[PDB]
Amino acid sequence: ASLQDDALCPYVCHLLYLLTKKENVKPFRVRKLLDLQAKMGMQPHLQALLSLYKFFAPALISVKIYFKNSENLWKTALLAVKQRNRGPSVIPVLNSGSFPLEQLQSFPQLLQNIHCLELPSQMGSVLNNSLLLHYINCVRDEPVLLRFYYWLSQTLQEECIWYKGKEFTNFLDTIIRAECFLQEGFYSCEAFLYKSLPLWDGLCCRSQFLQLVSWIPFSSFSEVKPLLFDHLAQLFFTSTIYFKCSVLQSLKELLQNWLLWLSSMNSVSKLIHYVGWLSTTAMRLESNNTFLLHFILDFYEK
Amino acid sequence: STKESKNEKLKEDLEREQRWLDEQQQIMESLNVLHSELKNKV
């Protein structure tokens, strides 16, 4: 009712933009807001509030937004550290009786509103927001799978082409951290690594690459070898002994992940035979250096 | 030195694993109680 006052109108609009839920978008309020828009014109705050109303109730309309004078006058340093503790471009900025996504700021809120969650317009912020990751872990929705696949694949392509570095390394580290969760590998990273492995020198982002091969989906040992393990052996037979220990660690982690997922046997048997052949060949290769032997034996204990 | 580095790495990963396990726990009780409430309501 304070929208009638034109001195409070922008601030009241900014407050309602944060406060509005789906239940508050009543037909009378939509009509009055449209009349106020006709009286004042398409003002920015009015347009933001009206876009929110359209998002909540599209049927009533047809029938992350900047506001002016929104400077935080109360921004002390301790209030700043509390605001930054309140949050538990490579990542797109998130843009919104379903629970609004912006209101999701606490774990009990997610616990109460998990059933009535709404999928974001962009799910990149899902990566650095563990709250939405909890719902992603069980949503099992087909369209969001393709939407995130194309998103992350094109993001990986653009980052890789722009690199030729610290921001790319940090982004890949965040991807790896998210990959540690969900207990299953992604496919955009798999396709990117397939495309870039033959072109890979072995030293651009070796730390980043070798942790993605650990999370590779289970597949028969007859299609990955022609496309994946050939270049792996190409690097392995010619790269440093420490790189050999590195790829040994990566493959033993892959074996652990595959056994964890399964808990068919011909595939893992062939993988073990292949890694053993690599093991004996390299053990000959390095004048019988025990440094690689330690990794061989640790892998065999696993 | 690799042995120590992996020791603290595994310790950190284990702590993160317990953190995730704890969080998903209350996630599970919340989901179960919500499901039971919806079942009883209908």
Partner: peptide, 12 residues
């Protein structure tokens, strides 16, 4: 961790 350690080993 240990992988960062191996990478700092190839740095040498």
């Amino acid at each position: 961790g240990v992988l960062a350690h191996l990478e700092r080993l190839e740095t040498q």
